[PDB]
Ligand binder design. Structure first.
Ligand SMILES: Nc1ncnc2c1ncn2[C@@H]1O[C@H](CSCC[C@H](N)C(=O)O)[C@@H](O)[C@H]1O
Ligand SMILES: Nc1ncnc2c1ncn2[C@@H]1O[C@H](CSCC[C@H](N)C(=O)O)[C@@H](O)[C@H]1O
Ligand SMILES: [Mg+2]
Ligand SMILES: [Mg+2]
Lengths: 219, 220
């Protein structure tokens, strides 16, 4: 992995500058005892560019952690735009709130604390959709079901992005016993059979373990 | 590279289906002595998806080869959409025209034969722009100047994509002797310095050699 990390540092040195709010969001993970699993700086910038191509005014994120990915995307929003992010762990949600406040995004970002599978039908009842872009990055086994709820909260042209769908190439092992690999494989099979979207999977290398993100556009 | 190749085939079995027109465009290369350097199927679907996000009506492509990338992007267009593709080699242009005709894309694709640096100022003079998406994929040394012309043919929100800007990590080598590597390094420096766009570089692995594509959006 060394060449991929060195090339990622080359790219972030040109195009992946992180202000105090993004660095503080990263620094908050270890002091809070949270896992070091945010998107990378360059992945962050890529999510921001996708939100700009979507001309996104309304973004939904499942899985906030410390709000690193949230800050990157919310920075693409217009003044009147909104990002709703779902986080199960009340400690993660409190840390993310501090980090979003430090980024001056309190007004545009709403953190909802609970399981995505409980909150997604709430968003349906509220008529919270449709969203211009949806980022699925929570627990891995129910990605397939999160995608079905995302469709209910989409319009034609909505972008749905799902992170961690390759898992170091372990998705090739049909006999994998790892929950996160089985979750990825089931989601990828659903995505291959889904006639409601146009989709691809991007292999991703860099500072993080070899992985990939799925991208889908609602027909 | 074996794991990346195996994962790419896994991905294209799910989401990278190629019809006769794309398979025929690939098959056309060997009989014409052309390099097997088109975008991969999965890269082709990615460019198609970027064109759909752009809601592209007008696309510009530098470097046609056999029209493989051209067919993937043109298929995102509405019928009244147009794609202009530039190609220096008349042998390549004639193969690409056959492949575009086979794909049913004759109305939507205009292949222009000559040096990109000669045609781009003609496009500005004709008012051919602005393009919703621009794909820079010709010879590598003038990438920096192709990008300057692309900005003259853009509007706010235009997506510019440049292929082959990592070259197996050789862009880390400040003493590279390879003009294509030197061209990518100069392009990536320019892109780092450019205040007219928001940009990133995506590292790309799969069936082809380790490389990367630059994505830039012209600021609003
Ligand atoms: N059922 C569930 N609903 C919502 N969030 C969940 C969940 N199960 C786990 N999570 C949360 O999903 C997150 C995954 S990590 C998210 C990383 C973040 N998007 C970033 O890149 O910065 C964790 O914070 C975890 O607590
Ligand atoms: N100065 C120049 N102007 C225009 N095209 C050029 C050029 N120098 C090289 N080319 C052409 O650029 C092409 C690069 S390969 C293009 C591959 C194609 N985009 C695909 O993915 O399917 C070759 O066809 C080459 O002949
Ligand atoms: Mg993730
Ligand atoms: Mg190329």
């Amino acid at each position: 992995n060394q060449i991929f990390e060195s090339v990622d540092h080359y790219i972030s040195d040109l195009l992946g500058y992180e202000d105090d709010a993004l660095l503080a969001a990263t620094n908050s993970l270890a002091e809070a005892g949270m896992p070091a699993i945010s998107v990378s700086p360059n992945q962050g910038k890529f999510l921001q560019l996708l939100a700009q191509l979507c001309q996104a005014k309304n973004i939904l994120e499942l899985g906030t952690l410390a709000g690193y990915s949230t800050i990157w995307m919310a920075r693409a929003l217009p003044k009147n735009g909104r990002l709703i992010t779902l986080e199960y762990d009340p400690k993660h949600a409190a840390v993310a709130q501090k980090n979003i406040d430090r980024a001056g995004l309190t007004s545009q970002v709403q953190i909802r604390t609970g399981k995505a599978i409980d909150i997604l039908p709430q968003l349906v009842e509220e008529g919270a959709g449709p969203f211009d872009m949806i980022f699925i990055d929570a627990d891995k086994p129910p990605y397939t079901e999160y995608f079905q709820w995302a469709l209910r909260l989409s319009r034609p042209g909505t972008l749905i992005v799902a992170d961690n769908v390759i898992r170091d190439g372990k998705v090739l092992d049909e006999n994998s016993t790892e929950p996160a690999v089985q979750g990825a494989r089931r989601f990828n099979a659903m995505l291959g059979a889904n006639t409601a979207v146009d989709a691809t999977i991007l292999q991703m290398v860099g500072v993080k373990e070899y992985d990939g993100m799925a991208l889908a556009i609602v027909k």
